[PDB]
Design a protein around this ligand. Structure first.
Ligand SMILES: *[C@@H]1O[C@H](CO)[C@@H](O[C@@H]2O[C@H](CO)[C@@H](O)[C@H](O)[C@H]2NC(C)=O)[C@H](O)[C@H]1NC(C)=O
Ligand SMILES: O[C@@H]1[C@@H](O)[C@@H](O)OC[C@H]1O
Ligand SMILES: [Mg+2]
Length: 440
C-alpha cells in the first residue's frame, strides 16, 4: 500500500515506564498507531475509494500488485472517528464511534518506539510486564485485549517492495489465527478469492492470511479473563495460503497453534476468583502483572514459566490455582501445565507439538510488538472467553464453562445494539526485571 496525504497522521501519545530492581521507574514518551485495516484507502491521485463497505473497486484493483501501487492509506481522526484517545499513561478504546464520514466498531493499535515511526520492540525473556485495566464498561461479548505478536518493527516497509506505508500507518499485522481478513499482506492487496462477510458489513477474507507467534497477555471483559501463549513453526510475520492458514477443518493442520495454552481462572475451575465483586473485582481498575521466567534466571535462558499476579487497592493477589478433578494442580503456565490441561480437557496439544514455551521464548528473543484492542467476535460470539463453549457441549464437562454469560450472548449486532458505549482503559504500562513493576 501507498501513503495518502489528505490527512496528517499524528499518533496519540502514551507514556510507558521502564523499571529497575527496587522499583524505581523512568517515564518513556511513546505513542500508538491505528492498524491499517481501519484506514481510508483511496487512489493516489485523488479521493476515489479502493475499498468501500466490504467490496474492492475492481478497476482500481485488478490484481494484488496494481492495487497496492494504486491505493493509499491515509491519516486517521483517532478520537472523533475511531474512538481512540490517550491521557498521559492511559489509553481509552471505545467500542462504537460515529465519525462524520464512517462508523467504526472496535479498534486495534500498536505501541510505537521513541522514533514515532517504527513499532516498539519488547524483549520479554526474564522480564515482568505490568499494566492497569478498567474493564468495568466491557460487558459479555466484548474483548479488551493486550498482547504481543512477532510483527516486524517497520510493519513490513523493508521486506515488501509494494508496501510503501509501513508501521507509521499500522501495516504488517499477524497473529496465530492467521487472519485472512487483513487487506494488505506482504505489500500486496489480499484480493484473490475475496469473499465479503455476511455479518460484518466492513469485512471480508482473501486467499492469504498473515501468521506469527502471539503472546496473549490479556483477553478479557468484566466477566472472565484469559492469558494465552500461542506458537507457530515459523519465525516472524509469514503469509499463509491453503492448509498453512489452518482455516476451518484444517484448524490443527496449519503452521500456528490457534487454541493456545490458556489459563482462564474460571475455565480452570475457580468460578469465584475474577469478575464483578470477586477476589479480583472487575467492577474497578486493577493491575495485571505477568512474569516471563527463564530456566536459568537470565535474559538469554529458555522460557520456562509464565506467572501472573494482580494488584488491587494496594493489595497483591496471587493467581488462582487450577481445580480440575484428575489433573495436577498448577497456578501458572508451564509446559507441564499445558500437557496436563490439554490431556484433562481432551484438546489437541498443538502448543506443545509446535514447540511450547521454548518456541514462545525464542519469539521473545527476536522481539515482539505490543498490541491493544477492543473487539466483538463474528465467528464465535466471544463464547470461548465468557460462556459455555462449544455451546453443543455439556457445561459440566471440564473445560467447557469459561464464564457466566449466556450461550445466546455476544452476537455482534446484539452487543453493538445494546452496549455501544462500552470501552476499555489500559494504563500505566511498565516493564522491568522481576519484582520491579509494582509494590509488594
Ligand atoms: C478461588 O481462588 C480464591 C482466591 O485464591 C480462593 O479464595 C478463598 O476463598 C475462601 C472461601 O470463600 C475464603 O475463605 C478465603 O479467604 C479465600 N482466599 C483468598 C486469598 O481470597 C478460593 O478458595 C478459590 N476457589 C476454589 C474452588 O479453589
Ligand atoms: O484466541 C482464541 C483461541 O484461544 C480460541 O479459544 O478460539 C478463539 C480465539 O479468538
Ligand atoms: Mg517497501
Amino acid at each position: 500500500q501507498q501513503v495518502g496525504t489528505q490527512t496528517a497522521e499524528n499518533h496519540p501519545k502514551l507514556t510507558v515506564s521502564q523499571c529497575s530492581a527496587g522499583g524505581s521507574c523512568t517515564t518513556e514518551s511513546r505513542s500508538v498507531v491505528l492498524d491499517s485495516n481501519w484506514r481510508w484507502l483511496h487512489t493516489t491521485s485523488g479521493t476515489t475509494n479502493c475499498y468501500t463497505g466490504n467490496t474492492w473497486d475492481a478497476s482500481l484493483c485488478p490484481d494484488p500488485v496494481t492495487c497496492a501501487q494504486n491505493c493509499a492509506l491515509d491519516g486517521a481522526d483517532y478520537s472523533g472517528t475511531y474512538g481512540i484517545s490517550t491521557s498521559g499513561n492511559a489509553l481509552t478504546l471505545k467500542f462504537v464511534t460515529n465519525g462524520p464520514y464512517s462508523t467504526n466498531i472496535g479498534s486495534r493499535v500498536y505501541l510505537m518506539s521513541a522514533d514515532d515511526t517504527n513499532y516498539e520492540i519488547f524483549k520479554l525473556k526474564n522480564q515482568e510486564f505490568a499494566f492497569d485495566v478498567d474493564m468495568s464498561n466491557l460487558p459479555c461479548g466484548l474483548n479488551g485485549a493486550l498482547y504481543f505478536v512477532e510483527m516486524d518493527a517497520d510493519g513490513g516497509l523493508s521486506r515488501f517492495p509494494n508496501n510503501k506505508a509501513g508501521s507509521k500507518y499500522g501495516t504488517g499485522y499477524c497473529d496465530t489465527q492467521c487472519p485472512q481478513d487483513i487487506k494488505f499482506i506482504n505489500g500486496e492487496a489480499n484480493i484473490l478469492g475475496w469473499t465479503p462477510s455476511s455479518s460484518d458489513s466492513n469485512a471480508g477474507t482473501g486467499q492469504y492470511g498473515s501468521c506469527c507467534n502471539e503472546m496473549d497477555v490479556w483477553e478479557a471483559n468484566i466477566n472472565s479473563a484469559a492469558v494465552t501463549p500461542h506458537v507457530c513453526n515459523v519465525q516472524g510475520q509469514t503469509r499463509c495460503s491453503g492448509t498453512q492458514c489452518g482455516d476451518g477443518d484444517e484448524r490443527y493442520d496449519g503452521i500456528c497453534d490457534k487454541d493456545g495454552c490458556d489459563f482462564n481462572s474460571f475455565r480452570m475451575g475457580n468460578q469465584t476468583f475474577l469478575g464483578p465483586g470477586k477476589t479480583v473485582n472487575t467492577n474497578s481498575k486493577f493491575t495485571v502483572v505477568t512474569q516471563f521466567l527463564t530456566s536459568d534466571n537470565t535474559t538469554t535462558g529458555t522460557l520456562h514459566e509464565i506467572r501472573r499476579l494482580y494488584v488491587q487497592n494496594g493489595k497483591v493477589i496471587a493467581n488462582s490455582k487450577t481445580n480440575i478433578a484428575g489433573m495436577s494442580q498448577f497456578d501458572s503456565i508451564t509446559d507441564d501445565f499445558c500437557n496436563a490441561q490439554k490431556t484433562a480437557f481432551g484438546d489437541t496439544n498443538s502448543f506443545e507439538n509446535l514447540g511450547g514455551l521454548n518456541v514462545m521464548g525464542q519469539a521473545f528473543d527476536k522481539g515482539v510488538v505490543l498490541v491493544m484492542s477492543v473487539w466483538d467476535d463474528h465467528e464465535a460470539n466471544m463464547l470461548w472467553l465468557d460462556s459455555d463453549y462449544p455451546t453443543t457441549s455439556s457445561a459440566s464437562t471440564p473445560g467447557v464453562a469459561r464464564g457466566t454469560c449466556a450461550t445466546t450472548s455476544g452476537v455482534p449486532a446484539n452487543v453493538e445494539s445494546q452496549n455501544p458505549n462500552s470501552s476499555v482503559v489500559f494504563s500505566n504500562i511498565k516493564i522491568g526485571p522481576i519484582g520491579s513493576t509494582y509494590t509488594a
